[PDB]
Amino acid sequence: VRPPVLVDIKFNPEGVDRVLKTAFADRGSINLADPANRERDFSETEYALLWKPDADLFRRAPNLKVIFSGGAGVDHIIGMAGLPDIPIVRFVDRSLTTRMSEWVVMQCLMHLRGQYGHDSHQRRREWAKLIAPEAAEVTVGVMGLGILGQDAVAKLKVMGFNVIGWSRTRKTIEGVETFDAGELDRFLAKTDILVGLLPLTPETTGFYDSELFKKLRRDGALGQPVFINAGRGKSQIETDIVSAVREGTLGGASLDVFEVEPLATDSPLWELENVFITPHDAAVSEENALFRHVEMQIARFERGEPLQFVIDRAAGY
């Protein structure tokens, strides 16, 4: 008999309860939201699925073999005291990648084509032809070339954009100029539409700021460059986005993530011209997908195969 999987995830508790009815069917689960588990024995527990876990979890479950993040991010876990030296697996919803690429391509097209203007005129019953350059005249600079960035690059290229990429270690991608960490300024100077698909680490906290926006290409085919972020909200400085749009440093933005979520009602972003807001719904997983992922990794682990999507502790993502 395999021991049940420990689950401590701060999502809709009623939703989690329901998924867990059919998850882990060979072993069951220990839902830490249930008061009947306040004094549960975790001595045999092998696997823990955690999202914003209780601080003393690792004292209670000292024999864990693998930690599974309940999210795509691991900032919620990585900084915890007493985090054991065991693999931490991030949630890579293999079906979510394509949905992030739908969002990225749509946002880039809406900026390329002038959706903001089209919609403003439509609401005023104004017939107003706009000029847009073809995609090939515009360079999209993708920051982050991991699971999400490499899919976005591929699809943006097919739509016709010139695409360049930036990552901590330079990638090799056919047809796409790619840059190392240290080449940030050069990469920004070539970029008309910046697409952010970075994890949140100390190095990427407050990264998208006034100074960065002033380095984007100023004499490109869109007139003024555009900032797009669907990575993590704490990577950007929103007051600097607001100032940059008002002063014309940025021609617009598309944002799915924010420093504080939900975005405050009084944020200036909501009504800023040429700014598109989605409420962190660009690529949210269907509720079972996390559990299917964890189950699959357990199966690999129990056949003696390598875990996938293991984070690099020293790098922080």
Ligand X SMILES: NC(=O)C1=CN([C@@H]2O[C@H](COP(=O)(O)OP(=O)(O)OC[C@H]3O[C@@H](n4cnc5c(N)ncnc54)[C@H](OP(=O)(O)O)[C@@H]3O)[C@@H](O)[C@H]2O)C=CC1
Lay out the site mask for its own copies across 79-108 (x = CB under 8 A, - = otherwise): ----------------x--xx-xxx-xx--
Instruction: Give the residue with the Cβ less far from ligand X, 231 or 252.
Output: 231
Active-site residue, from 111, 217, 232, 293 = 232
Q: Which residues contact 195 (CB under 8 A, 6 or more apart)?
A: 104, 108, 140, 141, 142, 143, 149, 152, 228, 230
Least Å from the CB of residue 163 to ligand X? 14
In the chain, DSSP finds a helix count (H) and a strand count (E) of 10, 12
Least Å from the CB of residue 116 to its own copies? 10
* Count of residues that bind its own copies according to CB under 8 A: 46
- Angle subtended at Cα 178 by Cα 172 and Cα 181, rounded to the nearest 5 degrees: 110
- Residue 201 token pair: 């680490």
**DSSP label of 173:** B
Q: Pairing relation of β-strands 66-69 and 177-179? A: unpaired
- The single residue among 118, 170, 215, 292 that binds its own copies, judged by CB under 8 A, is 118
**Cα distance between the two ends of the chain:** 34
Q: Indicate the SS3 state at residue 182.
A: helix
Q: Any binding-site annotation on 148?
A: yes
Q: Any binding-site annotation on 10?
A: no
Active site residue 113: no
Where are the extended beta strands (E) located within 160-234? 162-166, 177-179, 193-196, 226-229
Torsion of CA 63, 68, 74, 77, to 10 degrees: -30
Q: Indicate the SS3 state at residue 143.
A: strand
How far, in Å, CA of 305 to CA of 297, rounded? 9
- The single residue among 6, 67, 156, 282 that binds ligand X, judged by CB under 6 A, is 282
Q: Any binding-site annotation on 191?
A: no
Active-site residue, from 2, 280, 300, 303 = 280
Using Cβ positions, the residue closest to ligand X within the complex turns out to be 146
Binding of ligand X by 201 (CB under 6 A)? yes
Least Å from the CB of residue 195 to its own copies? 15
- The single residue among 113, 186, 214, 215 that binds its own copies, judged by CB under 8 A, is 113
Active site residue 232: yes
Instruction: Give the residue with the Cβ less far from ligand X, 149 or 252.
Output: 149
Binding of its own copies by 304 (CB under 8 A)? no
Cβ burial of 106 (10 Å; 0-12, 13-18, 19+) is middle
- Whole-number Cα distances in Å, 185 to 191, 195, 213, 222, 227: 10, 15, 11, 20, 15
Q: Any binding-site annotation on 145?
A: yes
Least Å from the CB of residue 257 to its own copies? 12
- The single residue among 66, 138, 148, 212 that binds ligand X, judged by CB under 6 A, is 148
Q: Decide if 257 contacts 232 (C-beta within 8 A).
A: yes
Catalytic residue set:
232, 280
Please give the residue ranges that form the binding site for its own copies (CB under 8 A): 95, 98-99, 101-103, 105-106, 109-110, 112-113, 115, 118-119, 121-123, 125, 127-130, 132, 134-136, 155, 158-160, 261-263, 265-267, 270-271, 276-281, 284
Please give the residue ranges that form the binding site for ligand X (CB under 6 A): 72-73, 100, 144-149, 167-169, 181, 197-201, 203-204, 230-232, 256-257, 280, 282-284, 317
